[PDB]
Amino acid sequence: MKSVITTVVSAADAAGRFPSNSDLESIQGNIQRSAARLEAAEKLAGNHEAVVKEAGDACFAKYAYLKNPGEAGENQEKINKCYRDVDHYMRLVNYCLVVGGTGPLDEWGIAGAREVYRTLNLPTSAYVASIAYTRDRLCVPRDMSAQAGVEFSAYLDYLINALS
Amino acid sequence: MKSVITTVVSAADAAGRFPSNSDLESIQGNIQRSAARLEAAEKLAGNHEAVVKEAGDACFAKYAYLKNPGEAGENQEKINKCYRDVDHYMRLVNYCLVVGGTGPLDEWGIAGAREVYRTLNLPTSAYVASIAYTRDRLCVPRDMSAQAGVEFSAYLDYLINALS
Amino acid sequence: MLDAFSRVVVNSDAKAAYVGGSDLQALKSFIADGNKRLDAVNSIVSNASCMVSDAVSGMICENPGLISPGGNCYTNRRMAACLRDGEIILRYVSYALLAGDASVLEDRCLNGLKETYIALGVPTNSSIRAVSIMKAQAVAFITNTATERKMSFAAGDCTSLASEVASYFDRVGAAIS
Amino acid sequence: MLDAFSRVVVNSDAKAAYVGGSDLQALKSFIADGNKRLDAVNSIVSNASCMVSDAVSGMICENPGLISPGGNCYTNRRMAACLRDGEIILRYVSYALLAGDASVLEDRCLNGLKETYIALGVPTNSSIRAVSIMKAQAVAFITNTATERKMSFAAGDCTSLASEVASYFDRVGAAIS
Amino acid sequence: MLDAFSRVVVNSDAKAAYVGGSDLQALKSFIADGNKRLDAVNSIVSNASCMVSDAVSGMICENPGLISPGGNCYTNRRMAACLRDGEIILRYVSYALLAGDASVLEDRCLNGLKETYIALGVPTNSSIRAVSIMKAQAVAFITNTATERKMSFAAGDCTSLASEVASYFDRVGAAIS
Amino acid sequence: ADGNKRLDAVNSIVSNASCMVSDAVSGMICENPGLISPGGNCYTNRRMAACLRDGEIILRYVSYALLAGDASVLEDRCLNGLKETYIALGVPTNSSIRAVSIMKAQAVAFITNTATERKMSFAAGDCTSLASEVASYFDRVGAAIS
Amino acid sequence: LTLPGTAETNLAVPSNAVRKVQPYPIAKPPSYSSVDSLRPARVSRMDADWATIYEQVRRQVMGNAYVMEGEAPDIDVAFSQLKGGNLTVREFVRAVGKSASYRTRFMEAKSSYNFVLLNFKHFLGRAPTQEEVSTHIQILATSGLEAEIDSYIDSDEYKALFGDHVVPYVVYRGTYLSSERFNRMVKANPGGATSDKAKSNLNMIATVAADLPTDAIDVMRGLPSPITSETLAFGTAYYWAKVEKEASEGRSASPIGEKIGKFDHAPISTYTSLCSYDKVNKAPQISVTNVGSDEHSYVSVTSKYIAPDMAAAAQMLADCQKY
Numbered sequence A, B: 001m002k003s004v005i006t007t008v009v010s011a012a013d014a015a016g017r018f019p020s021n022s023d024l025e026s027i028q029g030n031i032q033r034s035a036a037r038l039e040a041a042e043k044l045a046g047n048h049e050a051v052v053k054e055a056g057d058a059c060f061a062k063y064a065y066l067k068n069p070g071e072a073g074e075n076q077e078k079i080n081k082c083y084r085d086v087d088h089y090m091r092l093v094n095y096c097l098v099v100g101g102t103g104p105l106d107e108w109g110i111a112g113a114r115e116v117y118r119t120l121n122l123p124t125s126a127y128v129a130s131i132a133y134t135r136d137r138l139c140v141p142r143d144m145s146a147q148a149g150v151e152f153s154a155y156l157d158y159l160i161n162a163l164s
Numbered sequence C, D, E: 001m002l003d004a005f006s007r008v009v010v011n012s013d014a015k016a017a018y019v020g021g022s023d024l025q026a027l028k029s030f031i032a033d034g035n036k037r038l039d040a041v042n043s044i045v046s047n048a049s050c051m052v053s054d055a056v057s058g059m060i061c062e063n064p065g066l067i068s069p070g071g072n073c074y075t076n077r078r079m080a081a082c083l084r085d086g087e088i089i090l091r092y093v094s095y096a097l098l099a100g101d102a103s104v105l106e107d108r109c110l111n112g113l114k115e116t117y118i119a120l121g122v123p124t125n126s127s128i129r130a131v132s133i134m135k136a137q138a139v140a141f142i143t144n145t146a147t148e149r150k151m152s153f154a155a156g157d158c159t160s161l162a163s164e165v166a167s168y169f170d171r172v173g174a175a176i177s
Numbered sequence F: 001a002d003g004n005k006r007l008d009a010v011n012s013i014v015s016n017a018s019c020m021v022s023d024a025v026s027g028m029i030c031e032n033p034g035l036i037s038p039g040g041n042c043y044t045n046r047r048m049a050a051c052l053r054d055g056e057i058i059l060r061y062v063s064y065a066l067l068a069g070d071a072s073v074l075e076d077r078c079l080n081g082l083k084e085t086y087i088a089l090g091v092p093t094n095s096s097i098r099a100v101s102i103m104k105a106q107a108v109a110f111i112t113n114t115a116t117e118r119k120m121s122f123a124a125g126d127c128t129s130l131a132s133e134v135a136s137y138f139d140r141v142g143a144a145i146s
Numbered sequence G: 001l002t003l004p005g006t007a008e009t010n011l012a013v014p015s016n017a018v019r020k021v022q023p024y025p026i027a028k029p030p031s032y033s034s035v036d037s038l039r040p041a042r043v044s045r046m047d048a049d050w051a052t053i054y055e056q057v058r059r060q061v062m063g064n065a066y067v068m069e070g071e072a073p074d075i076d077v078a079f080s081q082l083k084g085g086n087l088t089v090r091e092f093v094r095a096v097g098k099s100a101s102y103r104t105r106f107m108e109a110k111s112s113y114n115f116v117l118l119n120f121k122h123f124l125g126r127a128p129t130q131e132e133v134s135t136h137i138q139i140l141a142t143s144g145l146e147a148e149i150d151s152y153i154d155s156d157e158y159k160a161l162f163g164d165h166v167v168p169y170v171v172y173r174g175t176y177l178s179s180e181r182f183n184r185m186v187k188a189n190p191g192g193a194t195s196d197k198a199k200s201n202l203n204m205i206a207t208v209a210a211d212l213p214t215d216a217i218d219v220m221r222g223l224p225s226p227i228t229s230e231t232l233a234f235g236t237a238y239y240w241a242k243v244e245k246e247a248s249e250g251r252s253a254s255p256i257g258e259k260i261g262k263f264d265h266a267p268i269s270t271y272t273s274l275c276s277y278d279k280v281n282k283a284p285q286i287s288v289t290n291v292g293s294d295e296h297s298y299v300s301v302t303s304k305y306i307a308p309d310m311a312a313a314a315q316m317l318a319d320c321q322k323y
């Protein structure tokens, strides 16, 4: 959606012209990253339950005040709801490595977040705790290759920047 | 002007957002694709006075009605204007190959051209008979490389299709 | 709207899955031959203005009553309208051949094409015929079986991609009919 | 507007000169360490909201006369404009690092920023100090000299670009003074 | 567009009659209980942000298909757009409670709500559950029977106004069906 | 058995199926102009557009009958009661015989590549047993409406 | 960004290099218009505040977009310069129309005829004619997106109606240039909660603004008028025709049956050939490709394809005395 192939056929059609030679330089750039971020996509997809096994109770390990009543985490089922709230993000982080752009992360996770979390009383400082814990825990030779872990971590402070 | 560098920093300027992650991926195609077209310039700029003489006359070998009295090439100083009217086109194709796109060919050689040559009575078929003789004098083992020899041919047809 | 990359993540979003390594080698196959398709869209946009005028004048030369008075391509305003009633079809399948699926073609070029041609009086089988010619001229441009003009490629096969562009040229034929 | 590949042609159309192998070596040298430039923007826009909010906060802790009544960052609305006025010019610097020259930064942000800022009453001596910290933040990323965040790269140097963005964060100091 | 005073005089203009004595007698009773209406509007719009987040969350807990994929409040933008969607409704019911008849509600809020809910795909009977929670919250907030937050009025009877504000939530649920 | 010529001969009819109906209608006027006279059948804009529809249904049902190879679905969802309804609509049977006889004689030129204005660039051979099989379908639809 | 006093950009005529900004907003058109006395007032730059102005730009120029708090940052830039005096509200809707937020929900998600129909509704507050469509759709083929938006704002129709300081709105004039120009403006502009967003094609005004005939349906014109003009027409009398219309404007039914393309068929009992009416005029659509060894020669039985009733003339024209 906000991808590389969508932003060249929309720049072709905002000027009303054919596919030129300057958009065919761009799709050659898709060949040079889709051996890196495509096998970064499978590394998150197989290890998806074990990173929220890290980062899920690491979020409450920083702030443990909201395991109280009158708060945002009331009981175990809201904490079971909270692990679904973070697992939707690492779904969408996986989705924009297959796409390439910041397409699925904007209108499925980022747009309306300042609306929803303010009125439903959800703190954004605990949402940026879980992703920044997932950022620095990325070790380069243990997990994947090296450039697969660059645009992995470039999406992780993309949505921190959309919640700071 | 219509680069692969410009068309993504102007598409992101119109949305008011930062340089994205797939915005840094179309520049990665210029880490790949620029080395094919940068030696396309050096075969043109070292040989640009050859091809305007040996294929500027080929439209005159096509059209023998041009030197009649009452016509488009009347005297010698309109034929001297004609080998300048075709050296300006190869100078822009040389400017297109080192920019990346169809940047300089639009506003310096295509915009205005439907109004100028009809009002001054210059036949538009005599320009594209000159460009098609330059396009059908390419071969891989002599002239240039086989990947530069398809993309230098992918600018002369665009000058044909904007006039034919 | 959607390329071939985001089509497989819309289809993996309704079933709430990830995009794992089991259903990736339909798309990991496609960026193996990324350079195969990408020269093959330059084979369509090179002789693009040639193949429009051969399509529309060959439509005229089979039904020669459109140049008669009362015909839809009679007057000189309407022939210019018809000649970029077929250039929009060429541009909006060349977008879809670059992207991978016809999700930018069916919503902007084909969504409401039916009653636009019905109300204006544009005859139906002549406009099918003028894009049936554009079906046949495009698949010869990328199998290198255009009989007059040959283009220079790396010698191999492109029969995966002639069948891709043939399916776009009768999505238009099924939305007009 | 104009990038670094298009800066060399508008210096060479004025002679009607063909570009070639006496100034293509500076044009090949852009593509030589192009990935050093392309990691540079990954180390600016990623940690960008903490970068812009620190420089306006350190400008306040360096001059508490703007928080008084009559100050230019007094009420709650003026702080949100000061957070917004600072993150437009952070974007237009990175639109010039991605290009290679300040054609976008001069002609889409600075052409009129001086005459706007006179008519409002905003003090220019604090906007120099607010863009001074954003110069000093960006040189701690492309020489990796930051305290609380150490990002990993291919090791070596990017000491060319640490002066190059210090050619872009003081063109705004030239226009606003 | 019309208040409770001008609903009288459009009925007197249909007879070409003067507003005499027997039909002003229902209207002087509207003004004598005129501060009861004014405390009733104030007890709705004060705790209005908790009121509309509680209605759209009890709609989730009784029908939890909306947070599932394929739903309608699944996406974070779709939940934000639904939480504003049932916030225009409480703004226009409180205009009709202030004015005294459902005239402003019927044309600036309900005139085309069924058209934009078929085309966008919003479920009609799951919207019914959202406004019937707000019917129960509004008749508790103006009769002061709300358990978590207690207001402070004088003593008396505000049960004609609870039948009044239930009559306005019934028009939202009828025009949506 | 003869699979590749069968796909060639259906390709040479459904490509030019919009000339084949507009010439067979116009030839039916060309040797009886009483259809377009006041009182005739193909006189209005409403009734001409039904006749240009009817030649397309008959040509698309013998297009599939070559593709399957057998005349079985041609007679049981096109011709199982077409004779009884043209007499109930007043469609003249003398004029409809001269519309299936034109569309026979355009179809045998396209398969045998003897069309006098277009040479479709085929391979070489003899597509002549199939051309009497299309003619076998076309005599059957002519014998139905009579 | 430009300069803290500017009235017009881009220099299309020579008389904007000397033109001043208007000190006061322009007056209303001086014809009578009995419907405009039932309408809300003009939102202008002098009388309204910035909470009223940004709401009413979003209610007319943006349709009803439901713009969230973070999304459209480009319109927040162009609103930051509207409050600074750097551009007028005529130039503010020019920056809105050339933004990427206007593109992503009206250009690249709608159709091509449908994009031109929304631009008359958003920028001019009416509906075009077919001669006005075909001049604005040539700019989308030869000059792209930004030269099409620049032709509305720099037109003579804009500066007389709104000028520099009035937000666009539906103007009720009294005397119109045709009587069909009135009732297509009202049809294109209904009131609250309308939002041309998932109405993925219009399809009713997309075929009514394709003929200078076919005056459209009167229940799409009695609906969006102001009330006290349509009471005693909406108790339960024409009310049920409005119920059907709103269930068929939403979900976007195509008017090939009832409105354009109108073939009175034969009776059902007069044929009885292929039994039922459901499967009467069905004949198969066959398309082969013949490229190598990937074909999918798929025969599909297509639907009731009807007579063109426009391509059948030609018939009784190309062979009138001829043939």
Ligand SMILES: *C(=C)C1=C(C)[C@@H](Cc2[nH]c(/C=C3N=C(/C=C4\NC(=O)[C@H](C)[C@H]4[C@@H](*)C)C(C)=C\3CCC(=O)O)c(CCC(=O)O)c2C)NC1=O
Pocket (backbone or CB within 6 Å): C062, C063, F016, F018, F019, F020, F023, F026, F027, F030, F031, F101, F102, F105, F106, F109, F110, F114, F115, F116, F117, F118, G323
């Ligand atoms: C007189 C007023 C008049 C006729 C008599 C009748 C002419 C007519 N033409 C044919 C034959 C063919 N029509 C064909 C169709 C086409 N030819 C093409 O090349 C394009 C693709 C297509 C659309 C126009 C073909 C292929 C033929 C056979 C070749 C040939 O011409 O012989 C017939 C049937 C044969 C016969 O004469 O018995 C008739 C009757 N139309 C008139 O206007």
Ligand SMILES: *C(C)[C@H]1/C(=C/C2=NC(=C\c3[nH]c(C[C@H]4NC(=O)C(C=C)=C4C)c(C)c3CCC(=O)O)/C(CCC(=O)O)=C2C)NC(=O)[C@@H]1C
Pocket (backbone or CB within 6 Å): B043, B044, B047, B048, B050, B051, B054, B137, B138, B139, B140, B142, B143
């Ligand atoms: C390839 C198609 C053939 C082939 C053709 C020959 N070309 C000959 C001369 C020639 N060709 C060009 C065009 C070429 N030279 C350039 O410098 C540029 C770009 C700037 C291009 C496209 C020119 C200008 C000339 C004349 C001067 C020269 O020789 O370079 C040629 C010699 C005979 C002749 O001059 O006509 C031949 C045979 N050569 C091949 O080997 C393959 C088969």
Ligand SMILES: *[C@@H](C)[C@H]1/C(=C/C2=NC(=C\c3[nH]c(C[C@H]4NC(=O)C(C=C)=C4C)c(C)c3CCC(=O)O)/C(CCC(=O)O)=C2C)NC(=O)[C@@H]1C
Pocket (backbone or CB within 6 Å): A021, A024, A025, B033, B036, B147, B151, C032, C033, C034, C035, C036, C038, C039, C040, C042, C043, C141, C142, C143, C144, C153, C154, C155, C156, C157, C158
């Ligand atoms: C099918 C239409 C053709 C055919 C196509 C093939 N092309 C193949 C490879 C290939 N294509 C390009 C084009 C690309 N280079 C440019 O400079 C530009 C524009 C600026 C473009 C769009 C390149 C570089 C390559 C080489 C890829 C590589 O190996 O590095 C190809 C090989 C398959 C593949 O590897 O992709 C085929 C089959 N060949 C044919 O015979 C038909 C007629």
Ligand SMILES: *[C@@H](C)[C@H]1/C(=C/C2=NC(=C\c3[nH]c(C[C@H]4NC(=O)C(C=C)=C4C)c(C)c3CCC(=O)O)/C(CCC(=O)O)=C2C)NC(=O)[C@@H]1C
Pocket (backbone or CB within 6 Å): E047, E050, E051, E054, E055, E057, E058, E059, E060, E061, E062, E132, E133, E136, E137, E140, E141, E145, E146, E147, E148, E149
């Ligand atoms: C915000 C907390 C307001 C407030 C609102 C009131 N809500 C009332 C009733 C009510 N609330 C819910 C939602 C709740 N129940 C659930 O089962 C779930 C989860 C699935 C949630 C979030 C429902 C379903 C209802 C019942 C509506 C009905 O009766 O049909 C209510 C009336 C009861 C009362 O409190 O007297 C009010 C006033 N309460 C407050 O004090 C703050 C200001």
Ligand SMILES: *[C@H](C)[C@H]1/C(=C/C2=NC(=C\c3[nH]c(C[C@H]4NC(=O)C(C=C)=C4C)c(C)c3CCC(=O)O)/C(CCC(=O)O)=C2C)NC(=O)[C@@H]1C
Pocket (backbone or CB within 6 Å): A043, A044, A045, A047, A050, A051, A054, A134, A137, A138, A139, A140, A142, A143
């Ligand atoms: C790299 C700096 C060090 C190193 C660090 C350790 N990591 C340890 C455990 C661990 N880390 C992760 C996150 C990582 N695994 C993933 O699958 C993904 C995303 C796809 C990421 C970012 C996880 C899930 C775990 C738990 C066990 C596992 O599945 O690997 C670890 C053990 C103790 C600890 O947590 O501190 C260390 C020491 N280890 C190394 O070998 C290099 C030098």
Ligand SMILES: *[C@H](C)[C@H]1/C(=C/C2=NC(=C\c3[nH]c(C[C@H]4NC(=O)C(C=C)=C4C)c(C)c3CCC(=O)O)/C(CCC(=O)O)=C2C)NC(=O)[C@@H]1C
Pocket (backbone or CB within 6 Å): D047, D048, D050, D051, D054, D055, D057, D058, D059, D060, D061, D062, D132, D133, D136, D137, D140, D145, D146, D147, D148, D149
């Ligand atoms: C998260 C905050 C950012 C980040 C920013 C960096 N700031 C850097 C230097 C710096 N910061 C301040 C403001 C600070 N000093 C104060 O005295 C007060 C309060 C009164 C505040 C808020 C100043 C004055 C400076 C020095 C600039 C100068 O004067 O030349 C900096 C570079 C060096 C450093 O790390 O300190 C960075 C990178 N750090 C992060 O990692 C995120 C992105």
Ligand SMILES: *[C@H](C)[C@H]1/C(=C/C2=NC(=C\c3[nH]c(C[C@H]4NC(=O)C(C=C)=C4C)c(C)c3CCC(=O)O)/C(CCC(=O)O)=C2C)NC(=O)[C@@H]1C
Pocket (backbone or CB within 6 Å): D056, D072, D073, D078, D079, D081, D082, D083, D085, D086, D088, D089, D108, D109, D113, D116, D120, D122, D123, D126, D127, D130, G001, G077, G078, G079, G080, G081, G082, G083, G084, G085, G086
């Ligand atoms: C913050 C670190 C600054 C500061 C900032 C303020 N800017 C204010 C208003 C304003 N700023 C601009 C320029 C901005 N808009 C653009 O479109 C572009 C470039 C493309 C830029 C740089 C404009 C046009 C405006 C007026 C429109 C508006 O925002 O209202 C502002 C508000 C002033 C007030 O009313 O109090 C502030 C506070 N001021 C400071 O003191 C530091 C240095």
Ligand SMILES: *[C@H](C)[C@H]1/C(=C/C2=NC(=C\c3[nH]c(C[C@H]4NC(=O)C(C=C)=C4C)c(C)c3CCC(=O)O)/C(CCC(=O)O)=C2C)NC(=O)[C@@H]1C
Pocket (backbone or CB within 6 Å): E032, E033, E034, E035, E036, E038, E039, E040, E042, E142, E143, E144, E153, E154, E155, E156, E157, E158
């Ligand atoms: C029904 C919702 C309540 C209730 C209401 C009563 N209020 C009575 C008198 C009264 N109320 C207000 C508040 C209101 N008037 C305003 O002008 C404004 C704000 C602008 C508000 C919020 C006022 C000022 C008065 C003045 C008269 C007085 O009390 O001296 C009242 C007494 C009878 C009457 O005046 O009609 C009643 C019954 N009390 C209840 O028990 C329910 C829960």
Ligand SMILES: *[C@H](C)[C@H]1/C(=C/C2=NC(=C\c3[nH]c(C[C@H]4NC(=O)C(C=C)=C4C)c(C)c3CCC(=O)O)/C(CCC(=O)O)=C2C)NC(=O)[C@@H]1C
Pocket (backbone or CB within 6 Å): F025, F035, F041, F042, F046, F047, F048, F050, F051, F052, F054, F055, F057, F058, F077, F078, F082, F085, F089, F091, F092, F095, F096, F099, G264, G265, G266, G271, G273, G274, G280, G281, G282
């Ligand atoms: C034109 C070459 C003919 C002719 C045609 C007319 N046919 C009329 C009505 C009609 N025709 C059919 C048969 C056709 N429709 C089918 O569905 C199928 C098989 C699946 C076939 C072969 C039917 C069933 C009908 C009645 C249904 C309907 O009209 O919709 C017709 C009547 C138009 C009118 O009078 O309103 C005409 C003129 N008539 C001719 O004179 C030539 C020979």
Ligand SMILES: *[C@H](C)[C@H]1/C(=C/C2=NC(=C\c3[nH]c(C[C@H]4NC(=O)C(C=C)=C4C)c(C)c3CCC(=O)O)/C(CCC(=O)O)=C2C)NC(=O)[C@@H]1C
Pocket (backbone or CB within 6 Å): E056, E066, E072, E073, E077, E078, E079, E081, E082, E083, E085, E086, E088, E089, E108, E109, E113, E116, E120, E122, E123, E126, E127, E130, G064, G065, G066, G067, G192, G193, G194, G195, G197
């Ligand atoms: C709420 C919990 C519902 C639900 C609501 C949704 N409504 C959506 C969009 C929408 N709603 C309206 C009507 C509203 N806006 C107005 O301006 C007025 C009256 C003045 C009213 C009554 C409009 C006009 C729109 C579209 C505008 C826009 O695009 O912002 C909506 C968005 C659909 C989507 O994007 O997916 C939702 C989800 N849906 C539910 O499931 C519950 C029952």
Ligand SMILES: *[C@H](C)[C@H]1/C(=C/C2=NC(=C\c3[nH]c(C[C@H]4NC(=O)C(C=C)=C4C)c(C)c3CCC(=O)O)/C(CCC(=O)O)=C2C)NC(=O)[C@@H]1C
Pocket (backbone or CB within 6 Å): C056, C066, C072, C073, C078, C079, C081, C082, C083, C084, C085, C086, C088, C108, C109, C110, C113, C116, C120, C122, C123, C126, C127, C130, G111, G112, G113, G133, G134, G137, G141
């Ligand atoms: C030529 C192959 C046809 C034929 C074509 C005509 N089309 C006429 C008008 C027209 N066509 C379209 C659709 C097309 N134009 C677009 O801009 C887009 C996409 C955005 C598409 C798909 C539209 C929208 C229009 C109306 C506006 C316009 O003038 O472009 C037309 C003019 C009719 C007249 O007024 O006389 C003709 C003749 N007609 C034929 O007979 C052949 C088969």
Ligand SMILES: *[C@H](C)[C@H]1/C(=C/C2=NC(=C\c3[nH]c(C[C@H]4NC(=O)C(C=C)=C4C)c(C)c3CCC(=O)O)/C(CCC(=O)O)=C2C)NC(=O)[C@@H]1C
Pocket (backbone or CB within 6 Å): G032, G033, G034, G035, G036, G172, G173, G174, G175, G176, G177, G178, G179, G182, G229
């Ligand atoms: C008077 C002898 C009639 C009658 C007339 C009414 N006409 C009313 C409004 C109106 N009329 C038109 C059509 C007129 N304007 C045009 O531009 C053109 C053609 C170019 C024509 C013929 C329009 C468009 C409108 C409404 C728009 C507007 O007024 O701005 C009208 C007002 C209705 C009301 O508000 O009550 C009346 C009364 N009605 C009669 O009783 C007699 C028979």
Ligand SMILES: *[C@H](C)[C@H]1/C(=C/C2=NC(=C\c3[nH]c(C[C@H]4NC(=O)C(C=C)=C4C)c(C)c3CCC(=O)O)/C(CCC(=O)O)=C2C)NC(=O)[C@@H]1C
Pocket (backbone or CB within 6 Å): F002, F003, F004, F005, F007, F008, F009, F011, F012, F111, F112, F113, F122, F123, F124, F125, F126, F127, G288, G289, G290, G291, G295, G297
């Ligand atoms: C008869 C109407 C034609 C004609 C046909 C012949 N084609 C022969 C071989 C052949 N035909 C095709 C095309 C066909 N095969 C397909 O899979 C499809 C897809 C729908 C089509 C249309 C192919 C690919 C081949 C094989 C390649 C080759 O030609 O060598 C053929 C040879 C005899 C046989 O093997 O059946 C004949 C006679 N030739 C004609 O003269 C008319 C025009």
Ligand SMILES: C=CC1=C(C)[C@@H](Cc2[nH]c(/C=C3N=C(/C=C4\NC(=O)[C@H](C)[C@H]4CC)C(C)=C\3CCC(=O)O)c(CCC(=O)O)c2C)NC1=O
Pocket (backbone or CB within 6 Å): C047, C050, C051, C054, C055, C057, C058, C060, C061, C062, C132, C133, C136, C137, C140, C141, C145, C146, C147, C148, C149, F015, F118
């Ligand atoms: C009565 C008038 C009349 C015409 C105008 C032509 C029009 C025409 N051309 C082709 C067929 C074709 N047309 C082209 C197009 C072109 N060939 C080139 O070399 C150029 C690049 C470009 C024209 C500028 C191509 C490549 C083919 C495929 C076969 C061929 O090369 O001829 C076809 C057959 C398509 C089909 O039905 O399958 C037709 C009808 N024929 C006619 O009967």
